[PDB]
Design a protein around this ligand. Structure first.
Ligand code: B12
Ligand code: B12
Ligand SMILES: Cc1cn([C@H]2C[C@H](O)[C@@H](COP(=O)(O)OP(=O)(O)OP(=O)(O)O)O2)c(=O)[nH]c1=O
Ligand SMILES: Cc1cn([C@H]2C[C@H](O)[C@@H](COP(=O)(O)OP(=O)(O)OP(=O)(O)O)O2)c(=O)[nH]c1=O
Ligand SMILES: Nc1nc2c(ncn2[C@@H]2O[C@H](COP(=O)(O)OP(=O)(O)O)[C@@H](O)[C@H]2O)c(=O)[nH]1
Ligand SMILES: Nc1nc2c(ncn2[C@@H]2O[C@H](COP(=O)(O)OP(=O)(O)O)[C@@H](O)[C@H]2O)c(=O)[nH]1
Ligand SMILES: C[C@H]1O[C@@H](n2cnc3c(N)ncnc32)[C@H](O)[C@@H]1O
Ligand SMILES: C[C@H]1O[C@@H](n2cnc3c(N)ncnc32)[C@H](O)[C@@H]1O
Ligand SMILES: [Mg+2]
Ligand SMILES: [Mg+2]
Lengths: 618, 612
């Protein structure tokens, strides 16, 4: 069906009470006095649609004598899609769109807008008008560069972004410092200063996982890094693997040794790569940290490598970024695309096109806190279009999350989105101009470059064809990711990202959720009966008088074994040009050897990173 | 006896084994390979002398002249008559080719000196102490954090007043949130220095919060963490007003311009809070900022907000100070202070310090500007208590305090005189014209009132209206390290002990050795070392007991008044610890604070014996 008619099915479905609570708390805009300027999700949709549509002022293919009509049409489409909650951008977009703008412009009826209204909106965006989820900054091996980075952590966090850094440039603890004949404190000690800095800045104010800290596997302090949180409470930590995944797996299988060294230290040491891995798995087994960041694999698919290089991800790992780049994210709720036993691909393709344009327009009205960021964003125009609602979609389709059927369905779904997002990038590049670095990227300098592995869909040949087309026109260096969508999946009343539902029924602080699809497919008699058990046990698995058919479809995270989590991640990653946020859930009974096996399997698959969490470990 | 003869009696006197340990530890220059470039104290005087005499290149009033100054610098340095703050000893010559810094002087060409001047690197930081502003924004706060790290890297201390930071809980418009407050941000500064060192840092920082800041009470209790900070309470108002409010049992309004947070508190209760904390742990101190500006020649165009970590210098934003001290114990001669020799060395010292500026490389450009615009110097003394010993003058006496004020007045006179000459010879400091030396008749940068020297000083300040090289010239620093180098007592402080064991070689005060009969010392020593004093020890000549007093023999008020005597003739501030007996109460501490408001002291630090 047409997207316009799908919109009609959803646009007047009101957010749940839980959703409305979240909206009131953090998203509805207020004046300096704490009075609400917005009271309904509708208000947010109008404000955000209007600010992002304003980007069309800059569109060189519109004559001035048509800009108003064209801008208005885009506000209209952005508004309807947002109000329907078919696509929602990353939280900072919702928070900060319209900061600096006269309040009598942000919500006025669209039929009353003038060209001058849109220009006033565009001109009055203030320095807090920061619409991206996160960033990566370099940390150079000097007191000067380190405290400059600390300053940037502070500035970025203030306006609401998260930040990642690879700290491997910092020379090992005890290395010679020529200026003082002294000893270097090493990356880990310095990370404590970054943590301390963030402790006094809020947005505010819950800042859990606001930072990413990576140290490479061959750094002389890697063993200390691995043991760091066992404070650094605002960091997520990952071990960086800049070499090819194949080379590290071969080294493990051969029981080889890794040379730990640094180009500005005499500190050198050899460690058994198996012992190192076991130390990593042992810590992950206990606490869930550190994760693994396959940087080499990110660079294999980075269209600007080696001119530019990915050294770090953002805090939740889903985007590998070069220095001073940002996360520009937004997600489609694919559960709203279910139609009588299938996914409405006609409506989905239209929304993919609209969503790419929306995210790309966000760049134009984004205001960054640092000059170098503005430059790096404009030069590559990297986007992060993702999905949520995936687990709920499978519930509707009656497909077990832990099945090859689901993984085949995922790869094909994702290949379809990638195809149409990249085709849109081509179109936008023809319309508005290519990303300035296109001419030096592998889309132009190389034959048959494709920014992901593929190999699991009937769309591959069509994808190859479009990638060839983008040699000539391309708006964006990359377009896709799958984010946690922790807050925005709640606003959308759907399951988060690509993850299975963690629980079918639970109480949060104090109303109880019950999965909506479960309510529609399970006999209302049986439900009222088993609701008690379900909440206590956290699964349908071992409940009598529950049809085997629904037990199979309605699996939760811990019903699904780790390899099925990992293989789902691989199925998606084959058709994503950035990365993916995915927790590999493991049962309490899991061993350190079990964790090692996940790592080894990960190395053979196409994933670009790994996070595991053992139930009960924390 | 004239400076030349005095140098002859000292120039060939080697540093003690004790002092030699300090020098081989961290003063002798090494390769990046770790090898010794310098092995004896004289090798140090050669480098430093030659580098500072390079400044004469800039002298608009030329190879014979530079060499001249290097010689006189060298001789006074080698004889340990005068010594610059440690960073000058550490960092002089950094970046300069080793073939230039030591080779025989008669082998020096003009080519050579110009090369030294050109090749001074970014580590060539020759000053002890800095002050930097911390503005009320995340941007300014973290720019200041970076500044702390950069200054600490090159070997400097740094101080700030954190009063501009709005109080904990205040509104932040940019986030609609709540401010963390000054004390929370100070923790970030502390963490920063935690990972930075010039070789390995106690009291590297000064943190001041003003008495009327709404978080003043949290700040007073801040340390009970911030291990690299010394803390002081700031009094930007006149000492008179606070004494008044205290005597009237008045109330102080706590407020901040960027907060709606405000509060009334009894001023006596705030003082008692301070005293109790000080009584427990020696912090925080009092900084009478208003009194510093009172004598600040550039007030209010520029304004003193903070001191360095030891408090002896009141600095406006981004200023530094290069200190150097004269060992007065070496000027003892036949029951007199050799005013002839001492005078020559003062002129030389002022020139030396003023030259250090020209060859100094600062880590930040706003600092280079501040230093070059005012040319503030900090010339001081060490060996004072040992001088009293030689003069057989009890430290805790009116004779001591009168002698002290006279010594200092004398130094003050000749220092400000030489600043007139150098101002004539090299040009005035750029802000002369807007300073009170020109804009008001009868401005004097200290209180005086304790010497017959005052009248001439009043005249020399007047001639200063036309020619003056430096905005102010004098300080008394702790001289912790340089006094041990000079084998003498530190700063203006009485000796803390007459006998202690350096490991297992014993030491007894070099001068006590001469006045006392060796036979008595052999017996006495045992008890002296356990009691840390001679006042109760049986069969010690009364005149010996009263002359060779140590810090704890001298009561709180006599320490304070000694600080007053010196301060009347110091245009900057003074480092002085007011020691108190272990049996002191919080009330005794309060009385010291109240007395200090009545004297001319610009700051106060107290330490109760055995509190830590
Ligand atoms: C998004 C997210 C995050 C983000 C949240 C910020 C963001 N970028 O959106 C960040 C990066 C903070 C994060 C971190 C971690 N998370 Co998480 N996270 C999620 C996720 C996907 C959504 C949560 C959410 O926003 N819900 C909606 C909001 C509106 O409700 P909320 O009540 O305000 O949510 C808050 C809490 O969930 C909290 N939180 C997030 N993760 C965790 C983990 C633990 C152990 C705790 C106590 C709290 C907590 O942060 C939220 C506010 O930002 C859920 C999965 C799920 N089923 O919900 C997990 C989930 C709670 N996380 C989990 C885990 C294990 C972790 C980590 C231990 C992973 C790691 N590598 O270390 C860390 C813990 C860090 C710490 N200091 O404790 C598990 C915990 C399982 C369990 N049995 O408790 C979950 C269920 C994912 C999973 N599939 O297992 N997470
Ligand atoms: C200079 C100095 C300082 C400097 C040292 C660096 C510098 N500016 O060069 C600073 C600012 C760090 C300082 C601080 C304090 N000091 Co102090 N300091 C001195 C002084 C004048 C010189 C000693 C020295 O360096 N000797 C030569 C060097 C080469 O040998 P050293 O053994 O390596 O010296 C080190 C120790 O003395 C140490 N140190 C300095 N002060 C203190 C205080 C205590 C309690 C301890 C354990 C160590 C210590 O720092 C030196 C190296 O930098 C002496 C007075 C004296 N007559 O010696 C005191 C002295 C040791 N300090 C004293 C006191 C009380 C303090 C403070 C508590 C005061 C305060 N306001 O907080 C603090 C303690 C801070 C802390 N973290 O413990 C008293 C201690 C009395 C006692 N019963 O032990 C002394 C004896 C001075 C006095 N007038 O009473 N001090
Ligand atoms: C100066 C200094 C550096 N470091 C660390 C921070 C950086 O990781 C690293 C380099 O610091 P730098 O600031 O580059 O020190 P430097 O330039 O004087 O010395 P070099 O020529 O050897 O670079 O050493 C400390 O841990 N403590 C210190 O005091
Ligand atoms: C942003 C932020 C500021 N602050 C403090 C730092 C400064 O002391 C003070 C000002 O911060 P600023 O960074 O200057 O805040 P702002 O400009 O966005 O808001 P305003 O106009 O109200 O100044 O608040 C916090 O404590 N936490 C924070 O998260
Ligand atoms: N500073 C900060 N950044 C965050 C936080 N949560 C998320 N981010 C950024 O947003 C990314 C993904 O969060 P996600 O759950 O998908 O976004 P959401 O649904 O808008 O909350 C993280 O990797 C960070 O880059 C936070 O609590 N603090
Ligand atoms: N960073 C730093 N600064 C210091 C240190 N010791 C002294 N200073 C600075 O020098 C001033 C007094 O030092 P002083 O002991 O008189 O000089 P020294 O004998 O040469 O070490 C203090 O106010 C500080 O500003 C130190 O250990 N670290
Ligand atoms: C629960 C959420 O926490 C994020 N998360 C936590 N730690 C890491 C990490 N080290 N690397 C990548 N993502 C992480 C996951 O991406 C997941 O979505
Ligand atoms: C031992 C040395 O410590 C310095 N010192 C320690 N703390 C302070 C302070 N808070 N204010 C001024 N000086 C201080 C004293 O000036 C003394 O000279
Ligand atoms: Mg460097
Ligand atoms: Mg501000």
């Amino acid at each position: 069906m047409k997207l316009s008619d799908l919109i009609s099915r959803w646009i007047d479905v009101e957010p749940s009470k839980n959703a409305q609570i979240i909206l009131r708390d953090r998203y509805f805009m207020k004046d300096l006095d704490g009075n609400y300027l917005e009271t309904k999700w509708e208000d947010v949709a109008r404000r955000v649609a209007r600010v992002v549509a304003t980007a069309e002022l800059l569109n060189p293919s519109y004559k001035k004598n048509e800009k108003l009509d064209r801008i208005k049409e885009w506000e209209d489409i952005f508004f309807r899609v947002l109000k329907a909650r078919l696509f929602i951008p990353n939280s900072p977009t919702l928070f900060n769109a319209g900061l600096g703008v006269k309040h009598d412009l942000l919500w006025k009826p669209i039929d009353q807008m003038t060209l001058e209204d849109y220009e006033e909106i565009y001109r009055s965006r203030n320095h807090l008008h920061m619409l991206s989820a996160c960033f990566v900054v370099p940390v150079g091996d000097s007191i000067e560069e380190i405290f400059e980075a600390v300053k940037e952590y502070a500035l970025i966090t203030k306006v609401g972004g998260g930040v990642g850094s690879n700290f491997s440039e910092l020379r090992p603890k005890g290395s010679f410092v020529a200026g003082t004949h002294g000893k270097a404190s090493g990356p880990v000690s310095f990370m404590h200063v970054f943590n301390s800095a963030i402790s006094v800045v809020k947005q505010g104010s819950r800042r859990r996982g606001a930072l990413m800290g990576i140290l490479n596997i061959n750094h002389p302090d890697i063993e200390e890094f691995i043991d760091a949180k066992k404070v650094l409470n605002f960091f997520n930590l990952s071990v960086g693997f800049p070499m090819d995944k194949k080379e590290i797996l071969k080294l493990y299988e051969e029981d080889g040794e890794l040379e730990l060294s640094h180009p500005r230290s005499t500190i050198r040491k050899k460690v058994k790569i198996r012992e190192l891995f076991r130390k990593i798995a042992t810590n992950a087994w206990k606490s869930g940290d550190p994760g693994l960041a396959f940087l080499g694999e990110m660079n294999k698919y980075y269209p600007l490598y080696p001119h530019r290089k990915i050294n770090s991800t953002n805090p939740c790992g889903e985007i590998g970024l070069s220095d001073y780049e940002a996360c520009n994210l937004g997600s489609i709720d694919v559960a709203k695309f279910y139609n009588n036993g299938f996914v409405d691909l006609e409506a989905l393709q239209e929304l993919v096109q609209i969503a790419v344009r929306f995210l790309d327009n966000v760049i134009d009205v984004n205001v960054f806190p640092i000059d170098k960021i503005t430059k790096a964003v404009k030069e590559s125009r990297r986007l992060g279009l993702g999905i949520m609602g995936f687990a709920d979609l499978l519930y509707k389709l009656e497909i077990p999350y832990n099945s090859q059927e689901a993984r085949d369905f995922a790869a094909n779904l994702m290949a379809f989105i990638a195809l149409h997002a990249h085709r849109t990038s081509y179109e936008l590049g023809k319309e508005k101009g290519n990303f300035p670095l296109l001419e030096i990227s592998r889309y132009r300098t190389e034959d048959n470059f494709v920014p992901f592995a593929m190999g699991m869909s009937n769309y591959d040949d069509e994808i190859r064809e479009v990638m060839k087309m983008t040699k000539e026109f391309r708006r964006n260096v990359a377009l896709l990711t799958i984010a946690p969508t922790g807050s925005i999946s709640n606003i959308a009343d759907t399951s988060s990202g690509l993850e299975p539902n963690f629980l079918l029924a639970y109480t949060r602080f104090p109303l109880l959720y019950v999965n909506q699809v479960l309510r529609e497919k399970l006999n209302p008699e049986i439900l009222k009966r088993i609701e008690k058990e379900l909440i206590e046990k956290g699964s349908l698995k071992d409940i009598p008088d529950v049809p085997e058919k629904i037990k199979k479809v309605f699996v939760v995270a811990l019903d699904i074994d780790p390899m099925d989590h990992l293989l789902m991640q691989d199925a998606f990653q084959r058709y994503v040009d950035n990365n993916i946020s995915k927790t590999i859930n493991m049962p309490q009974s899991a061993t350190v050897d079990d964790v090692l096996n996940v790592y080894l399997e990960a190395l053979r698959t196409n994933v670009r990173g790994i996070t595991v969490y053992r139930d009960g470990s924390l």
